[PDB]
Curated annotation (Swiss-Prot), chain B:
Phylogenetic classification of the source organism: Eukaryota, Metazoa, Chordata, Craniata, Vertebrata
UniProt PTM: Isoform MLC3 is acetylated at position 2.
Superkingdom classification of source: Eukaryota
Residues of the full protein shown: 40 to 187 of 188
Protein's name according to its UniProt entry: Myosin light chain 1/3, skeletal muscle isoform
Domain EF-hand: 5-40, 82-117, 117-148
Naturally occurring in which organism (per UniProt): Mus musculus (Mouse)
GO cellular component, one term: myosin complex
UniProtKB/Swiss-Prot annotation, chains C, E:
Modified positions (Phosphoserine) in chain numbering: S55
MF GO annotations: calcium ion binding; structural constituent of muscle
BP-aspect Gene Ontology terms: muscle contraction; skeletal muscle tissue development
Name the UniProt record assigns to this protein: Myosin regulatory light chain 11
Species this protein is from: Mus musculus
PANTHER family (UniProt xref): MYOSIN REGULATORY LIGHT CHAIN 2
Swiss-Prot record, chain D:
Residues with the Phosphoserine modification: S5, S48
Organismal lineage: Eukaryota, Metazoa, Chordata, Craniata, Vertebrata
Protein name: Myosin-4
Tissues/organs with expression: Expressed in type 2b myofibers in the tibialis anterior muscle (at protein level).
Family that this chain belongs to: Belongs to the TRAFAC class myosin-kinesin ATPase superfamily. Myosin family.
Free-text note regarding domains: The rodlike tail sequence is highly repetitive, showing cycles of a 28-residue repeat pattern composed of 4 heptapeptides, characteristic for alpha-helical coiled coils.
Free-text function comment from the UniProt entry: Muscle contraction.
Phosphothreonine carried by residues: T33, T38
Location of the Myosin N-terminal SH3-like domain: 2-51
């Protein structure tokens, strides 16, 4: 089945090969095209690996640790929420109701 | 076309990269804006239809947000990027003895000497310490770490 | 963003006060709640002023609606802890005062001078100029 | 390896020598190779090289490109590296080195 | 076909929720019913959406009318067990997968391919291709 798929996607004529029981029979020329494409595809696969590694590594640390990053927005907004609610009575009540469950 | 949700996610990434406050990203950064959105573009993908300048080169061009939106859609979102199946059989070219193990020196050599060549600085930064005695590096564990 | 954790937390706070006619927080219920709360903050105008933040009859559904201000920031527990974490290289003893003061004041969605005074009056600190981030995270949700 | 098209060309010192096809028009190829010069020959006289995996191969029927240069190059590559014997399809091919061998 | 067994079963389910003003299931009653039910499925729109299946005011008589869909099959306990029994020659370990798949798909009032997927995702089975009929009978009425 692996040969059936491989021969089916590489566009080779049915005059140029035969399927057997243990071996596949090929005309001359054909395995040169496969070796050249194998070299080319391996080079294309290696650039994909290097690109995924750069995907992982191109974490801009200004998007995880700088001034106007997600976290400092959370600190500024939650601290701004805290300054309002540290005065309100029903904020203060629920904080001492629940230690008494 | 993109969703409103996709447009806002692409914008949230954009609003960090224009850090000078210009509403404009410097053209060099666009490949790493794409990496920041979880796509994995090759430098060959980056210099063609994404319109990037030379590597590590600033100043030459800048990109507005609305210009960035087809530069996500028609680029890495319009192609194959590779899967697990690619990497496993590409690594098996260098699996001499069939055990899922490749020498750390050979794996660093494939990253640094072949393809879109990695800096040694990049290679150490992506290395999770998985080197034994002369039991070397499990390459499947390496691929799963780099694709998580 | 009103979570199941938050609304169940609010449900028990409602249910401890309760006991009045089928699920409504009223004036007396609050007044005798203060008796077990250790503090005589039961003054009638202030007590009945807290009813003005709803249209009437404080059932549990109304009680959640009253807390609509509270949710308007409200990042969950370890998100605020992991937010402050990025400003600590030194590993508890935490954020140096000067850096934190700059970060709020002159950078970002900038703090006004009154906002800085509002925080320095209630921040935990040392005598050299360092600020406890984890103690600030505890102060936001409160347990003392 | 390079996609420059390495192919064997007729010469009169080495009967077939490795050449690089590069530029081709109609029946004529302007080819580079081992001496670094460019000359023009009929493409019909210029015959496919096998990739390095088939260099020194045990049996010549397992070469993908089968022509007299591929046969001569494999026999040269075998013989220069001490190996007297090579198979060719049904044949066993024997190149006598005139040395006594161990 | 609404049986005395079924309506009395429904009556206790109504009566446990109840306690609200003389025999009406309301929003609060459902909300505090969920507190003893172990799951925070108390979300206000979904809770008040369940009122739309009646014209108004869910008393016990209305509650039976709301369950009008439920009765539209609902053959009694041992009848479904007896129906499945006819298709078991081997006496518990029960119905072979291929035969059951044919029985539903190409025999009688034929199952659609979606209906077959809807069942295979929740049927009990072995690793060879047999299907527990009695465990399916238990799943229809549920007790786990």
């Amino acid at each position: 089945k692996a040969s059936e798929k491989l021969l089916g996607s590489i566009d080779i004529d049915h005059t140029q090969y035969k399927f057997g029981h243990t071996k596949v029979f090929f005309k001359a020329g054909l395995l040169g095209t496969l070796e050249e494409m194998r070299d080319e595809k391996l080079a294309q696969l290696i650039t994909r690996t290097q690109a995924v590694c750069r995907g992982y590594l191109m974490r801009v640390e200004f998007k995880k640790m700088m001034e106007r990053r997600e976290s400092i927005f959370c600190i500024q907004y939650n601290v701004r929420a805290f300054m309002n609610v540290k005065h309100w009575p029903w904020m203060k009540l629920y904080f001492k109701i629940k230690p008494l469950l | 076309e993109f969703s409103k949700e996709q447009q806002e996610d692409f914008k949230e990434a954009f609003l960090l990269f224009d850090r000078t406050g210009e509403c404009k990203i410097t053209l060099s950064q666009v490949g790493d804006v794409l990496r920041a959105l979880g796509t994995n573009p090759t430098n060959a993908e980056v210099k063609k239809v994404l319109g990037n300048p030379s590597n590590e080169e600033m100043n030459a061009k800048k990109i507005e947000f609305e210009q960035f939106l087809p530069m996500m859609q028609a680029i890495s979102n319009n192609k194959d990027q590779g899967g697990y199946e690619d990497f496993v059989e590409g690594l098996r070219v260098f699996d001499k003895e069939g055990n899922g193990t490749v020498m750390g020196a050979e794996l660093r050599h494939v990253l640094a000497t072949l393809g879109e060549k990695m800096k040694e600085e990049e290679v150490e930064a992506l290395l999770a310490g998985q080197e034994d005695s002369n039991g070397c590096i499990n390459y499947e564990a390496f691929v799963k770490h780099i694709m998580s | 963003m009103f979570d199941q954790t938050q609304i169940q937390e609010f449900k028990e706070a409602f249910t401890v006060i309760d006991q009045n006619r089928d699920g409504i927080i009223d004036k007396e219920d609050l007044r005798d709640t203060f008796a077990a709360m250790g503090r005589l903050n039961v003054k009638n105008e202030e007590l009945d002023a807290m009813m003005k933040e709803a249209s009437g009859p404080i059932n549990f559904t109304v009680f959640l609606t009253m807390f609509g201000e509270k949710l308007k920031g409200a990042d969950p527990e370890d998100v605020i802890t992991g937010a402050f974490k990025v400003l600590d290289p030194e590993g508890k003893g935490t954020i140096k005062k000067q850096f934190l003061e700059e970060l709020l004041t002159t950078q970002c969605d900038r703090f006004s001078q009154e906002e800085i005074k509002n925080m320095w009056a209630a921040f935990p600190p040392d005598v050299g100029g360092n600020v406890d981030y984890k103690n600030i995270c505890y102060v936001i949700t409160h347990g003392d | 390896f390079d996609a420059k098209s390495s192919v064997f060309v007729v010469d009169a010192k080495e009967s077939y020598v490795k050449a690089t096809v590069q530029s081709r028009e109609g029946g004529k190829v302007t080819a580079k190779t081992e001496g670094g010069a460019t000359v023009t020959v009929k493409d019909d006289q210029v015959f496919s090289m096998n990739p390095p995996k088939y260099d020194k191969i045990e049996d010549m029927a397992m070469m993908t490109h089968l022509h007299e240069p591929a046969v001569l190059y494999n026999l040269k590559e075998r013989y220069a590296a001490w190996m007297i014997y090579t198979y060719s399809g049904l044949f066993c091919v024997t190149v006598n080195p005139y040395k006594w061998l161990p």
